[PDB]
Paper text:
One attractive candidate is NS5, responsible for the catalysis of the 5’-RNA capping, methylation and RNA synthesis, during flavivirus genome replication. It comprises an N-terminal S-adenosyl-L-methionine (SAM)-dependent methyltransferase (MTase) domain and an RNA-dependent RNA polymerase (RdRP) domain at the C-terminus. The N-terminal MTase adopts the classical Rossmann fold, composed of six helices surrounding a central 7-stranded β-sheet and possesses a cap binding pocket where the cap guanosine is held during 2’-O-methylation by stacking interactions with a phenylalanine residue conserved in all flaviviruses.
Two different crystal forms, orthorhombic P212121 and hexagonal P65, were obtained, containing six independent NS5 molecules in each asymmetric unit. Despite the limited resolution (4 Å and 4.8 Å resolution for the P212121 and P65 crystals, respectively), the resulting electron density maps not only showed a perfect fitting of the two molecular replacement models but also allowed the tracing of bulky side chains, as well as the ten amino acids linker (residues 263–272), joining the MTase to the backside of the RdRP domain in four out of the six molecules of the asymmetric unit. Anisotropic diffraction was observed, particularly in the P212121 crystals and correction was applied during data processing. Extra difference densities were also seen in the SAM/SAH binding pockets to accommodate the ligands in identical positions to those previously reported, although none of these compounds were added to the crystallization solutions. The crystallographic asymmetric unit of both crystals consists of three dimers (named AB, CD and EF in P212121 and A’B’, C’D’ and E’F’ in P65 crystals), in which the monomers are related by pseudo-twofold molecular axes. Each monomer contributes >1200 Å2 (30% of the total surface) to the dimer interface. Dimer-dimer interactions (Interface II) are also conserved in both ZIKV NS5 crystal forms and involve contacts between molecules B-C and D-E (P212121 crystals) and B’-C’ and D’-A” (P65 crystals, with A” corresponding to a symmetry related A’ molecule). Three distinct NS5 regions are implicated in interface II contacts, burying >1000 Å2 of surface area between monomers in each pair.
Author numbering: 6 to 888
Amino acid sequence: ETLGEKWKARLNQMSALEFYSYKKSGITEVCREEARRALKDGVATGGHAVSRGSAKLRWLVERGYLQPYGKVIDLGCGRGGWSYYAATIRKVQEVKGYTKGGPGHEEPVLVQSYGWNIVRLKSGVDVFHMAAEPCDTLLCDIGESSSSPEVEEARTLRVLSMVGDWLEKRPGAFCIKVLCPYTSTMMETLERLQRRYGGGLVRVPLSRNSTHEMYWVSGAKSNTIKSVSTTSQLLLGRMDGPRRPVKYEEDVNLGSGTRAVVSCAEAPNMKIIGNRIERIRSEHAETWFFDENHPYRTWAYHGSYEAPTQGSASSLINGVVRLLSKPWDVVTGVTGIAMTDTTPYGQQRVFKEKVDTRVPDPQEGTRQVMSMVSSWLWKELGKHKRPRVCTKEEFINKVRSNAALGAIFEEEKEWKTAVEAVNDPRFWALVDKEREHHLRGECQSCVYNMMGKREKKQGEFGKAKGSRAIWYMWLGARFLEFEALGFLNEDHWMGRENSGGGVEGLGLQRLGYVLEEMSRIPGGRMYADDTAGWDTRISRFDLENEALITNQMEKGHRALALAIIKYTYQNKVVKVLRPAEKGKTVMDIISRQDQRGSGQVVTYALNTFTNLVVQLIRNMEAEEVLEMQDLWLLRRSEKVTNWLQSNGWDRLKRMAVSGDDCVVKPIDDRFAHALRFLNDMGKVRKDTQEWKPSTGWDNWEEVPFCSHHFNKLHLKDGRSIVVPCRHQDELIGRARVSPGAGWSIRETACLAKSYAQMWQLLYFHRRDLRLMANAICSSVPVDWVPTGRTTWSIHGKGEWMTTEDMLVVWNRVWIEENDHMEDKTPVTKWTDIPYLGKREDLWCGSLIGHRPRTTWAENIKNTVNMVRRIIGDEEKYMDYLST
Ligand SMILES: Nc1ncnc2c1ncn2[C@@H]1O[C@H](CSCC[C@H](N)C(=O)O)[C@@H](O)[C@H]1O
Ligand SMILES: [Zn+2]
Ligand SMILES: [Zn+2]
């Protein structure tokens, strides 16, 4: 009936060659070949448009049909060229992009375009079901072209019926894709919506002649019938007559590097750290400069200089495990797992969103409750035990050669390994120099080195996930730390003996008995919620409450300890890698005064201590001790210790805290909603509504702690044992990954057998895990030594790292030293040990009963012998499970 319905009717009536003639007829395109080579390789620093949209926004803004500023929201970001051209715009200060991705559709692409430090993209977002947020610049490139206009209209109508909820929160500028602007109902809806919110409709000539797509933009204004008739008229005319020529233009060059950002960081205490700062400038004043494009909000930018890049994102496959696990070639949770990006880029694109935050300063009443509980806990812990200066002897006793250098200055660049340095008196001479400087109150060398951690983690966007940062000091600074405070890890201040709540050292075997004994305790439900990024939530108040143990020290120990505390913990200086613009990489040096590193000696101890303080505070709030105004200021300060010395240990042995993670069994169910002191301290719950009640649990077998839930199993004879478990796909993926680049197959099979014996030792109750471990240990030479690390948990001591038989190892760890199993009778055979329940094994990620696992299990000897043949025959193998 209309100029558009008739044009679309003609466009459908054509054939494939008339289609090809008309599609590109008379528009402008972009010289996209440069950008598409940089994308073929993945060259982020090239600074090219990831899409053709970058030019559509370039045109819509540069012609002046858009007035972009402030906080931007890209709806349907797809790759993200719109978001990436937004990051370049001067008045923009944060760009949020949302997309769906997944199967078939476009996952977000990560580049180094100018301003990449303000770009947060997510996938798996059906935006119709996303709530509204008040953005300053609204972007919607969400359209879905088709042959029949009946679905074009409905899809644009659903698109608008969604974006209106967003637009009624008044953004300053907008650009929304309009796929069908040419039908009766669409003309009606466009007129009514232009009246109710403003704006104007523009057709872009870069856009193909094959869709009626127009854009609803802010800085422009025009009538709907007029612009639509303009577009349909011109489209109808370009069909007949001359096939008119294409106009070439060049793609917008986005640039590269970070962007100048809000710097609301606290001023530095210059005289604590100035020695180290000016030492670094005196050492690297050659290329010393200040980059204005620091993407640091909560860190004090102190400068940068050129440096070499470290790490990679490449992930190699362990073919032993993979070829033996051919049926897991399908599960996404297994094959999508890979390595973590430890490059400067991969470290910073996690840094700018996980570390560049500033904690709310808890109120003084919560501050006083924190200090009260911390002092009471220092008293109750330092009751039996008392501090002591750790010795250089114990330091070299615990040390081994696989530690990290921390090579910062020229005086520390001699050695290559740890054991090489520990027996050289020049080392202890510089240590004594820094110790006497610490006693005088000046820090020269205690500087933090930082980079991303190499982890075996789930892949995101079908790519390598960004690496969480780890930052450690110089071994001499770690020695000063140890002589001051390492007594907390040495003397087991956190062991369940002295504390009651902690479990410092206890392996994953006994912890299930701790859970059973805690479940036998009556009360409410069991509440175990992980804390979001523990190290980043630590405040100065938490640190100053931790510095209280010094009350029980002597004068020299307290001098060294408080010197290191104040010059190291309460004042931190860091050296990090950052990808500079156009290839080059730089090292920046920054500073702050709160949070804590995972590279500290007493990381586990400090995490467990402040976590227990918080749990005590939450049990006080749950059991109504702390009133609602007491966040502001403390009323009746006595009744805090009145409850501490009446129920402190009583509620304390109902706790299991291990650094980051925690488990509590309170008195009643109110613990689920005692969240106000918890939120005020800066210790929020990870990815759950900040005020929603906590999810409790009843059956202790289904409680997670340190990535494991435990199960009780009766033996085939009668004894009762408690075993750890997690999802099978995670362990299979971790084993499938090879951490190292360039390792010989001998050592890769060493890792294969390491994982194999780890499974035989821990996850034997999983049918596939024991089966595959027997198969790996079979096809792998029992000669070679297991090397490498499996799971980074400190509760994994490393018991499967020997060619000794796992049956004997099993008897020793589960019966002879089993403190919670009295019967010392060692069972003699493998198949006497029971599996997990059929249903519970299937639930924890097992593939039993399915035809691929059946097929692979019947050809197991074929495949294992294939493995032996590939390694190299006439090596000493062993045919482990036969039944
Ligand atoms: N409902 C939805 N929510 C989020 N993303 C969607 C979506 N529907 C489609 N998408 C994705 O968003 C893309 C829209 S085109 C993306 C253009 C982008 N703004 C640019 O800068 O060039 C599609 O490829 C599709 O995969
Ligand atoms: Zn120092
Ligand atoms: Zn389980």
